[PDB]
Design an enzyme around this catalytic site. Structure first.
Site, mmCIF file in Angstrom:
data_model
loop_
_atom_site.group_PDB
_atom_site.id
_atom_site.type_symbol
_atom_site.label_atom_id
_atom_site.label_comp_id
_atom_site.label_asym_id
_atom_site.label_seq_id
_atom_site.Cartn_x
_atom_site.Cartn_y
_atom_site.Cartn_z
ATOM 1 N N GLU A 35 19.672 43.873 76.056
ATOM 2 C CA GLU A 35 19.547 43.559 74.609
ATOM 3 C C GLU A 35 18.668 44.620 73.956
ATOM 4 O OE1 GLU A 35 19.016 39.500 72.541
ATOM 5 O OE2 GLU A 35 17.019 40.145 73.294
ATOM 6 N N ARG A 100 22.660 38.654 76.199
ATOM 7 C CA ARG A 100 23.022 38.019 74.914
ATOM 8 C C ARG A 100 24.184 38.721 74.215
ATOM 9 N NH1 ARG A 100 17.179 37.065 73.151
ATOM 10 N NH2 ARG A 100 16.770 34.918 73.812
HETATM 11 C C1 LIG Z 1 10.018 36.524 71.167
HETATM 12 C C2 LIG Z 1 10.464 36.089 69.771
HETATM 13 C C3 LIG Z 1 10.644 37.277 68.858
HETATM 14 N N1 LIG Z 1 11.103 36.929 67.499
HETATM 15 C C4 LIG Z 1 12.394 36.937 67.147
HETATM 16 N N2 LIG Z 1 13.310 37.444 67.924
HETATM 17 C C5 LIG Z 1 14.543 37.462 67.269
HETATM 18 C C6 LIG Z 1 15.723 37.979 67.955
HETATM 19 N N3 LIG Z 1 15.625 38.256 69.262
HETATM 20 C C7 LIG Z 1 16.709 38.748 69.880
HETATM 21 C C8 LIG Z 1 17.905 38.933 69.229
HETATM 22 C C9 LIG Z 1 17.930 38.633 67.867
HETATM 23 N N4 LIG Z 1 19.037 38.801 67.135
HETATM 24 N N5 LIG Z 1 16.842 38.161 67.249
HETATM 25 C C10 LIG Z 1 14.523 36.897 66.026
HETATM 26 S S1 LIG Z 1 12.923 36.437 65.574
HETATM 27 C C11 LIG Z 1 10.099 36.738 66.501
HETATM 28 C C12 LIG Z 1 9.676 35.451 66.198
HETATM 29 C C13 LIG Z 1 8.719 35.237 65.213
HETATM 30 C C14 LIG Z 1 8.233 33.854 64.958
HETATM 31 C C15 LIG Z 1 8.919 32.974 64.130
HETATM 32 C C16 LIG Z 1 8.453 31.688 63.915
HETATM 33 C C17 LIG Z 1 7.300 31.225 64.530
HETATM 34 C C18 LIG Z 1 6.783 29.834 64.259
HETATM 35 C C19 LIG Z 1 5.266 29.873 64.099
HETATM 36 N N6 LIG Z 1 4.671 28.909 63.160
HETATM 37 C C20 LIG Z 1 5.623 28.001 62.504
HETATM 38 C C21 LIG Z 1 4.903 27.162 61.472
HETATM 39 N N7 LIG Z 1 3.814 26.384 62.062
HETATM 40 C C22 LIG Z 1 3.112 25.596 61.044
HETATM 41 C C23 LIG Z 1 2.892 27.266 62.773
HETATM 42 C C24 LIG Z 1 3.623 28.095 63.802
HETATM 43 C C25 LIG Z 1 6.614 32.101 65.355
HETATM 44 C C26 LIG Z 1 7.076 33.389 65.578
HETATM 45 C C27 LIG Z 1 8.196 36.345 64.550
HETATM 46 C C28 LIG Z 1 8.616 37.629 64.856
HETATM 47 C C29 LIG Z 1 9.585 37.846 65.836
HETATM 48 C C30 LIG Z 1 10.073 39.209 66.123
#
Ligand SMILES: CCCN(c1nc(-c2nccc(N)n2)cs1)c1cc(-c2ccc(CCN3CCN(C)CC3)cc2)ccc1C
Ligand SMILES: CCCN(c1nc(-c2nccc(N)n2)cs1)c1cc(-c2ccc(CCN3CCN(C)CC3)cc2)ccc1C
Ligand SMILES: O=c1ccn([C@@H]2O[C@H](COP(=O)(O)OP(=O)(O)O)[C@@H](O)[C@H]2O)c(=O)[nH]1
Ligand SMILES: O=c1ccn([C@@H]2O[C@H](COP(=O)(O)OP(=O)(O)O)[C@@H](O)[C@H]2O)c(=O)[nH]1
Ligand code: NA
Ligand code: NA
Lengths: 230, 230
Positions: A35, A100
Site C-alpha cells: 500500500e 488493500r
Molecule cells: C493509521 C491511521 C492513519 N490515518 C488514516 N489512514 C487513512 C488511509 N490509510 C490507508 C489507505 C487510505 N486510503 N487511507 C485514512 S486516515 C489517519 C487517521 C487520523 C485520525 C482520524 C480520527 C481520529 C479520531 C480521534 N479523535 C476522535 C474524536 N474524539 C473526541 C477524540 C479522538 C484519530 C486519528 C488522522 C490522520 C491519519 C493519516
C-alpha cells in the site's frame, strides 16, 4: 498465464504488511503490491508528497482528507498497474497480492473521513465521481479477497507493537468504527458498492488475533486452498 | 476517418465559447467539446459539484484551488474522451474542437494558482504527478492549436459584456498575468512542458480584438486553411 489478483484487507495493524511479506517469500509465482500509504508511513517524489500529506492530515484532517485520499488512491492504481504490467510474465501460476484495494480506499477510509466531517459533501461527491471514473478508465478487478480479521483491541495492541509515533494517539473507538465497516463489507456483505462484480468475488476470512509471525503454516494452507478454487 | 483534435486556447473572455459555437454550425463534420468550467459558470452531479467548487473558489482560493483544478481537469478528460468515442463516426473529414485543453488546465490555470500561493508546493507537486499520470493512463493528443489572441483590455471589456456577477471583480492585472503565460506558451513557445510532442504541434494565432460575431468569415477561412495543412 493470466495473473490472479488478490486483495489483502483488514483493519489498521491487523498484520497485512507482515502477511504479504511472508507470502512473497513462499513462491517465485507470488508477488505483492504494498500500500502506498503504508510505504509513506516508513527520496521519491511520491514518498516526499506522501510524507507531507500524512503529517498535514494528522494536524488538520478536515483540510487534507480529500487531497490525501485522492493521492493515496492514484498512487495505489499506479503501483498495482506497474506490477500487473511488469511482473510474473514467466510464472506458471501467477498471483499478485495487493495490500488493500481501491475499494478499501473508498468504502473504508474515504467513507469514514466523510462520516467524521473531514470531507464536506462536495469533496465526498467529487471523490466518488473521480473514483467511479478513474477505476473505469477491468485490469485491476479482483479474483479474490483475503480478510485478515482482528479485534479492535488486537489492532490497538499491534499499533503499540509497531511504535509509529504519529499512531500512538489513535483511539480504540476509531479502530472499532473501521472494524464495523470491514465486517459490514466482507463478512455480512451488507455494504453496497458501485462495483457490481464485488458481490460475487470470493472472500477468505482468516482470524489473525493469534500471533502468526513464527506460526503461519495453517494460514498459508488456507490461502493455497482458496487460490485453487479461483 | 481519424478525428482531428484541435484545441481553442485563449485568455478569459477572449471569445472561445463564441468561436466554438460559430464553428460547430458550419459543418456536420465539425463537433465541439465545451470546457466543463465554462459550463459550470452558466442538475447533473458534475454541474452541482462544479457550481459549489467555483463559489468556494471565489470565497477562499487557497483552500479550494487543488480540488477545483483536479475536478476541472478530470471533467475535461471525461468530456473529451466521450466526444472522441461518441461522435463523428460517419464523417468524411472529422474535426473535434476542444474549448481549451489539459495543457491550459496545468500550464495556465493551475500554474497561476501555485504562483499566487493558492496551492502550496505539495498540492502543486501532487497535481503535476496526477496530471502526468492521468494523461498517460495518446487518444487526446492534439493535431493543432488555435490561439485566440486578445489584449488584456479586450478580455476585461468582454468580461463586462458577458455580465457574470462573480467575474466583475476580476482585475486587469490577473488577465495580464494569464495573457503573458499564453504568449510564452503559444507565441514565443518559450514555456517548457512535460509533453514533448507539444513543441511540434502546429499553432494558428488569430487576432480576435475586433468583434467577430457578425463578421467571422476571414477567421474561419484561416481555420479551413490551417486544417488542410494537418
Ligand atoms: C493509521 C491511521 C492513519 N490515518 C488514516 N489512514 C487513512 C488511509 N490509510 C490507508 C489507505 C487510505 N486510503 N487511507 C485514512 S486516515 C489517519 C487517521 C487520523 C485520525 C482520524 C480520527 C481520529 C479520531 C480521534 N479523535 C476522535 C474524536 N474524539 C473526541 C477524540 C479522538 C484519530 C486519528 C488522522 C490522520 C491519519 C493519516
Ligand atoms: C473567470 C476566472 C475564474 N477563475 C479561475 N478559473 C480557473 C480555470 N478556468 C478554466 C479552466 C481551469 N483549469 N481553471 C482557475 S481560477 C477564478 C479566479 C479567481 C481569482 C484569482 C485571483 C484574482 C486576483 C485578485 N486580487 C489579487 C490581489 N490584489 C491585491 C487584489 C486583486 C481574482 C480572482 C477566483 C476564483 C475563480 C474561480
Ligand atoms: O502476528 C503478528 C502480526 C503482526 N505483528 C506486529 O503487529 C504490528 C502491525 O503489523 P502490520 O504492520 O503487518 O499491520 P498492517 O497495518 O500492515 O495490517 C507490527 O509491529 C507487526 O510486527 C505481530 O507481532 N504479530
Ligand atoms: O467577437 C466577440 C467575441 C465575444 N464577445 C462577447 O465577449 C464575451 C465573452 O465571450 P466568450 O464567452 O466567447 O469568451 P471565452 O471566455 O469563452 O473566451 C461574451 O459576452 C461574448 O458574447 C463579443 O461581443 N464579440
Ligand atoms: Na515471490
Ligand atoms: Na457541426
Amino acid at each position: 498465464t493470466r495473473i490472479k489478483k488478490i486483495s489483502i484487507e483488514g483493519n489498521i495493524a491487523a498484520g497485512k504488511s507482515t502477511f504479504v511479506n511472508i507470502l512473497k517469500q513462499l513462491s517465485e509465482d507470488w508477488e505483492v503490491v504494498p500500500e502506498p500509504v503504508a510505504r509513506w508511513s516508513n527520496l521519491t517524489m511520491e514518498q516526499k508528497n506522501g510524507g507531507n500529506v500524512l503529517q498535514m492530515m494528522y494536524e488538520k484532517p478536515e483540510r487534507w482528507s480529500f487531497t490525501f485520499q485522492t493521492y493515496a488512491c492514484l498512487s495505489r492504481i499506479r503501483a498495482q498497474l506497474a506490477s500487473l504490467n511488469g511482473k510474473l510474465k514467466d510464472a506458471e501460476k501467477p498471483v499478485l497480492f495487493f495490500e488493500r484495494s481501491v475499494y478499501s480506499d473508498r468504502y473504508i477510509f474515504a467513507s469514514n473521513l466523510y462520516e467524521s466531517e473531514s470531507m464536506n459533501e462536495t469533496e465526498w461527491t467529487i471523490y466518488q465521481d473521480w473514483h467511479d471514473w478513474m477505476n473505469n478508465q477491468q485490469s485491476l478487478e479482483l479474483d479474490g479477497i483475503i480478510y485478515l480479521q482482528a479485534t479492535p483491541e488486537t489492532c490497538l495492541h499491534r499499533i503499540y507493537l509497531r511504535g509509529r509515533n504519529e499512531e500512538q494517539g489513535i483511539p480504540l473507538e476509531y479502530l472499532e468504527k473501521l472494524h464495523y465497516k470491514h465486517e459490514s463489507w466482507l463478512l455480512h456483505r451488507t455494504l453496497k458498492t458501485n462495483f457490481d462484480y464485488l458481490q460475487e468475488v470470493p472472500i477468505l476470512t482468516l482470524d489473525v488475533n493469534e500471533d502468526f509471525k513464527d506460526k503461519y503454516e495453517s494460514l498459508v494452507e488456507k490461502v493455497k486452498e482458496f487460490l485453487s478454487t479461483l
